[PDB]
Homo-oligomer: A and B are copies of this chain.
Amino acid sequence: HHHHHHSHMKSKFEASIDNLKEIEMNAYAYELIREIVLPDMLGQDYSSMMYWAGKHLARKFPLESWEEFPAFFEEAGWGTLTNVSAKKQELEFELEGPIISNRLKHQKEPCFQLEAGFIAEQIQLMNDQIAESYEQVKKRADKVVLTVKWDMK
């Protein structure tokens, strides 16, 4: 895996959204965009495109350490991310919440490639000695499990 992972600057707009964390909206409005409008426009390519959008997003919103993942996920409305395993070359998280529960109940196969790509890219941005990573998104009854593991280069 020969690639130098590095972050890049946010635009003025991208930086400005931090100031909107205190403005209240609702999860219906959120799903309307993320889980209706987007899949409607992207169709069969939605999964691969979200994966790479997750990596692209990581580059704009780089974090400094693994411990920061849960807070980012929660604030981003991606759900509650709990660590089940944290080993030298493997991370496993549970991800859940009312929006996710509704997806698991009513969608054939919910997609979490945005989240998977984001974590994979963050891990690489933080450590230039990481070669390639592999991600798994496993559906359970009331939650999903995100697993990212990797080799050293």
Contacts and interface: CB of A to CB of B under 8 A. Distances in A.
Interface of A: 11-14, 16-38, 40-42, 49-50, 52-53, 56-57, 60, 75-78, 98-99, 102-103, 105-107, 114
Contacts of A41: 38, 42, 49-50, 52-53
A-side interface mostly:
helix
Q: How many monomers of this chain does the complex have?
A: 2
Contacts of A29: 25, 30, 75-78
A98 B16 contact: no
Contacts of A56: 40
B30 A30 contact: yes
Contacts of A99: 20, 23
A117 B82 CA distance: 40
B28 A107 contact: no
B27 A106 contact: no
Given A23-B99, A103-B13, A106-B12, A28 B37 contact: no
A110 to B, nearest CB: 9
Contact of A38 (B33, B76, B103): B33
A11 B102 CA distance: 13
Nearest to A98: B23
Contacts of A23: 26-28, 98-99
